[model samples]
Target: QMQVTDVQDNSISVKWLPSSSPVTGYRVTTTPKNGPGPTKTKTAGPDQTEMTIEGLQPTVEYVVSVYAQNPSGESQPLVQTAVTTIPAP
Candidate 1:
């Protein structure tokens, strides 16, 4: 499961449920929609189920994916999409 919230022009928050097996950590990635941009990634401890991603482009659509990793391997990712807010005057 994936959750996307608190969206802004330059940031957004993401959360997900833990894997059924024990995990060493979680990996999150964000990609810009319909354009070329540097993809961003963040790592969180096993205990963490949420993280806030910042420094995104304003008014751009993004696809976010999260994966749980264990000593064995990484689980299939949970994916979601959200659009950043437009710039304010």
Candidate 2:
């Protein structure tokens, strides 16, 4: 349900399939691995299945989660793993 694409030294892009269940919008969040960074979040409409997050450290791993947002609340997230590219030498 999730795909991580276009990884770069300081950024990553995420894509997902639409939920079978009803949803008002979607939320994308990411946190660095091993507790070394702050969590980041983004909100998008139901039609949006892709988003890009940048300004991250090079060669680091991150955990990404995507959730469908409905009137009641946030739904269970689709999780994926991603890694930033090596820094330019």
Candidate 3:
């Protein structure tokens, strides 16, 4: 399972429960909702269950997913949607 903990004009923080398998790391992917924007990817260590994705646009909707990776392969992704906060004055 995954949850969104915080959101800013250009970043979001997420947390998730580790998969049952022995995970070596995690892959996080973020995609913009408006048209064809560049996708972003990040990696986290095995001990990490939370991460912050930066460099997003203000007030944009983004699809995000997290996958656990082991020697065998990557687990099915846990997906969620988040809207970036409006920009500050």
Candidate 4:
């Protein structure tokens, strides 16, 4: 299963549990929940257990989704949602 962990001000981290089945990689997407479409999509390989999403606007709500991939295609998205921290003046 995919899981989200280690969320930060300008960045958020995610990790997935190991599986016996073969996996080609992973796809990560981040969208501003209160605004426009997705801001980023990051892809990682089977060996990768985690990814960090960055370059986000502070004080905004974001929706994050992760999907497992293989030679055939991608699996159903595993989702994690969070809001970025606003910078203090």
Model 1 spans with C-alpha error above 4 angstroms: none
**How would the candidate models be sorted by TM-score, starting from the highest?**
2, 1, 3, 4
Highest lDDT against the true fold, candidate: 3
Candidate 4 lDDT score relative to the true structure = 0.71
lDDT of 4 by residue, 49-88 (tens): 7888888766677877767776688565554555465563
TM-score result, candidate 1: 0.84
- Residue-wise lDDT of candidate 2 within 1-89, one digit each (tens)? 78777888888888888888888889888888775869998889989999999877777878788878876886667556655556745
Candidate 2 weakest lDDT stretch, 10 residues: 79-88
lDDT score for residue 79 of model 4: 48
In model 3, the Cα lDDT at residue 16 comes to 84
C-alpha lDDT of candidate 2 relative to the true structure: 0.80
Superposed on all Cα atoms, the candidates' RMSDs to the truth, in angstroms, are 1.8, 1.7, 1.8, 2.6
lDDT of 4 at 69: 77
Q: How many clashes (backbone N, Cα, C below 3 Å) per candidate?
A: 0, 0, 0, 0
Task: Between candidates 2 and 3, name the one with more favorable lDDT.
Answer: 3
* TM-score for all models, in order of appearance: 0.84, 0.86, 0.84, 0.73
lDDT of 3: 0.81
Cα lDDT of model 3 by residue, 1-89, tens digit: 78888988888889988878788888899988676789998988889989888888887888888878887875556556655656755
**Distance (Å) between predicted and true CA of 3, model 1?**
1.4
Candidate 1, residues 1-89, lDDT tens digits: the string is 77776787788887788878778888888889778989998888889988899988887888888877887876556545655556644
